[PDB]
Paper text:
The T3SS [name] utilizes energy from ATP hydrolysis to separate chaperone proteins from effector proteins, unfold effector proteins and eventually force them through the central channel of the secretion apparatus. Using a crystallographic approach, in the present study we reveal atomic details for ATP binding by the highly conserved T3SS [name] [name] from [name]. The [name] domain exhibits an α/β Rossmann fold comprising a twisted plane of nine parallel β-strands that is sandwiched by seven α-helices on both sides.
[name]Δ1-83 was highly soluble and eluted from the size-exclusion chromatography column as a monomer. Using PDBePISA software to analyse the crystal structure of [name]Δ1-83, we did not observe an oligomeric assembly, consistent with the results of size-exclusion chromatography. The overall structure of [name]Δ1-83 is similar to that of other T3SS ATPases, including the monomeric [name]Δ1–79 N-terminal truncation. It includes a conserved [name] domain spanning residues 84–354, and a C-terminal helical bundle domain spanning residues 355–430. The loop connecting α10 and α11 is missing in the electron density map, reflecting an intrinsic flexibility in this region. In the unliganded [name] structure, a number of water molecules, and a SO42- ion occupy the P-loop. In the unliganded [name]Δ1-83 structure, the side chains of the catalytically important residues K165 (Walker A motif from the P-loop) and D249 (Walker B motif) are connected by a salt bridge. The luminal loop is located below the P-loop and exhibits relatively stable folding, as demonstrated by the observation of sufficient electron density for this region, and the average B-factor of the loop (residues 305–315) was 81.9 Å2.
Author numbering: -4 to -1, 84 to 380, 398 to 430
């Protein structure tokens, strides 16, 4: 029973907040200083309170805005091994999208990693729209957990205000590991992979707090899962794969090969694709995948590779409008 409240409001915009609710850096100063307190534990919305996911959440990233289109209110998994560009991708998603407010939660990262992110925010137009909650690796399992809840809570308040909120949580694997430790310390039995069954049981309550509301406002959430290399095939990834509305997988093959972002579209899916894009889009996109699968058949030892790879590849500094992306799609299937 967390009776613990935390600060929420426009006064946090620009702020870097720690697991104890105090501000330790800024990447922007905000003209408003609204601060209220709100509970860090909160039930997800009632089913009757949710709106259908129908309007797309545009990312300004060609390959996902076209083949893996996201909806406002959705929850999307990001599954990456190390050094495959995951943090560049998170930063792309923040930069080239159109949310009113971005809440980021970094869980158990090294202080260098939290600084990468803060550095990014300090040089970005979104600086006045973001809040960063972190728990560096010198913090306790409890503090790491509360970092995730504080992040969600702040998002929740901005959603109740009406805003289109984007929530990023990096990582769920360190959140789960911290939750595990808390559970072992309370004396419960380890199920498969040393995790007490309660860590996986609690996930839905955390991961279903996002969504779009009838009353106005939405949280669209991106959750990171750090993969090992073919190690145990990964219980947590599977759980997340099943709880969420789709998953983007970052490929090693594509990462070493220079193909950034290293998004493998074969291993990826938005489970709300059908219902956030045109009939026209579906067909153009379906045609692009056909073009892909066939280009993959040549990769077993024609000229439309350069043009396609040029479509996929995208420097983290560039954002493409939906029209631009679809414009580009049209020329590769014509
Ligand atoms: Mg786009
Ligand atoms: Mg990151
Ligand atoms: Mg400490
Ligand atoms: Mg709350
Ligand atoms: Mg994991
Ligand atoms: Mg583990
Ligand atoms: Mg499945
Ligand atoms: Mg239609």
């Amino acid at each position: 029973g967390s009776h613990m409240h935390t600060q929420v409001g426009r006064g946090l915009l620009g702020a870097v907040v720690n697991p104890l609710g105090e501000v330790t850096d800024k990447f922007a100063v905000t003209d408003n200083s609204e601060i209220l307190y709100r509970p860090v534990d909160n039930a997800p919305p009632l089913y009757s309170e949710r709106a259908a996911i129908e309007k797309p959440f545009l990312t300004g990233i060609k390959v996902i805005d076209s083949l893996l289109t996201c909806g406002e209110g959705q929850r999307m998994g990001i599954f990456a091994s190390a050094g495959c560009g995951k943090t560049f991708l998170m930063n792309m998603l923040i930069e080239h999208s159109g949310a009113d407010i971005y809440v980021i939660g970094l869980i158990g990262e090294r202080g260098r990693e939290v600084t990468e992110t803060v550095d990014y925010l300090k040089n970005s137009e979104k600086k006045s729209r973001c809040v960063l909650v972190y728990a560096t690796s010198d913090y306790s399992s409890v503090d790491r957990c509360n970092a995730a809840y504080i992040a969600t809570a702040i998002a929740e308040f901005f959603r109740t205000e009406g805003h289109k909120v984007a929530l990023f949580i990096d990582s769920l694997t360190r959140y789960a590991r911290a939750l595990r430790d808390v559970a072992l310390a309370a004396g419960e039995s380890p199920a498969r992979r040393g995790y007490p069954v309660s860590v996986f049981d609690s996930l839905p309550r955390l991961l279903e707090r996002p969504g779009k509301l009838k009353a106005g406002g939405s949280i669209t959430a991106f959750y990171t899962v750090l993969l090992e290399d073919d190690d145990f095939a990964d219980p947590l990834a599977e759980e997340v794969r099943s709880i969420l509305d789709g998953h983007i997988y970052l490929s090693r093959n594509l990462a070493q090969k220079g193909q950034f972002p290293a998004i493998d579209s074969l291993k990826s899916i938005s489970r709300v694709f059908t219902q956030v894009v045109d009939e026209k889009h579906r067909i153009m996109a379906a045609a692009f995948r056909e073009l892909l699968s066939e280009i993959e058949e040549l990769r077993t030892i024609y000229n439309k590779i350069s043009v396609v790879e040029s479509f996929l590849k995208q420097d983290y500094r560039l954002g493409f409008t939906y029209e631009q992306t679809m414009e580009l799609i049209g020329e590769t299937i014509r």
